[PDB]
Design a protein around this ligand. Sequence first.
Ligand SMILES: Nc1ncnc2c1ncn2[C@@H]1O[C@H](COP(=O)(O)OP(=O)(O)OP(=O)(O)O)[C@@H](O)[C@H]1O
Ligand SMILES: O=C(NOC[C@H](O)CO)c1oc2ccncc2c1Nc1ccc(I)cc1F
Ligand SMILES: [Mg+2]
Length: 289
Amino acid sequence: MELKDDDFEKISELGAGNGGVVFKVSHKPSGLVMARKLIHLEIKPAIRNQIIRELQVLHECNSPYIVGFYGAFYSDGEISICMEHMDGGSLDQVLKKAGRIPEQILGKVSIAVIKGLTYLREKHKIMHRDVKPSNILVNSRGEIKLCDFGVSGQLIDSMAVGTRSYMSPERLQGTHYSVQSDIWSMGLSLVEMAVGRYPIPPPDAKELELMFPPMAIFELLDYIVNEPPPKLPSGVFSLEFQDFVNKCLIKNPAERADLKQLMVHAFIKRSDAEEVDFAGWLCSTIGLN
Ligand SMILES: Nc1ncnc2c1ncn2[C@@H]1O[C@H](COP(=O)(O)OP(=O)(O)OP(=O)(O)O)[C@@H](O)[C@H]1O
Ligand SMILES: O=C(NOC[C@H](O)CO)c1oc2ccncc2c1Nc1ccc(I)cc1F
Ligand SMILES: [Mg+2]
């Protein structure tokens, strides 16, 4: 069935970010609860049809590790993307409530991200372009899924920041980037979620004892490109996890691990095996089920 603006009704607001908002909505004809992302684009009527045409590939993006698509359309100023509502929210929200995410749980997340990126690359020849805790969504059935990935080339162009960057040194320095950049972002997201705050600048010894002003824009970006990369602190995390993120966070993109290598890394092989009630933990920590 085709989706159209007058067929919806706002239930609540799921949040916002550097531009458009997302509503939890009810599609009246179907009865389905959905997440409707609205993106404001003062943009000519020709190229906004291309965007919709290009977003139709999302109907073929079916994976347990990728947020489901219902449809896309242009309303009155705004292009609407309608997706699966994920009742656990994004990992940036669960981090706020959780304080930290345990390593075992990050093992399950790492698995999901790797397998999602792999799906998008192998089956659709696309890079994410925007991996970070807020674009990894989770639900009470224990699923972990990626969203907000770069399907439509046009949409990427029509949007082209914030105060915290998950961009890789190479992408920060110019156009010379591609799929290896998603690895960096994943690695940084993981350190963030393990430690409970954005890992740049790194915490001093005294701030690490406590766990176990904000930087200016240029200061921070300079740190990412010119200063050694962030590390998981020693002692409180397994050596294999430490290696995992170190392999993700190698400044040189060719030297950096790729998805094939990460898939067979000791930390994944260990997390594959482990028995973890992610569904249970998630609800327990945010108060749902
Ligand atoms: N499908 C969904 N189900 C449930 N919540 C969602 C869904 N999509 C987005 N959200 C929520 O909406 C919020 C805003 O999302 P949006 O993608 O507009 O920005 P963001 O990714 O949070 O931050 P940024 O602006 O840096 O991308 C997210 O933080 C997330 O909590
Ligand atoms: O939402 C995106 N960025 O977040 C920016 C924030 O809202 C800030 O304003 C975004 O960027 C793209 C670029 C190209 N193609 C698609 C998208 C796309 N959305 C998208 C992709 C897959 C699925 I499942 C659902 C989606 F909502
Ligand atoms: Mg987002």
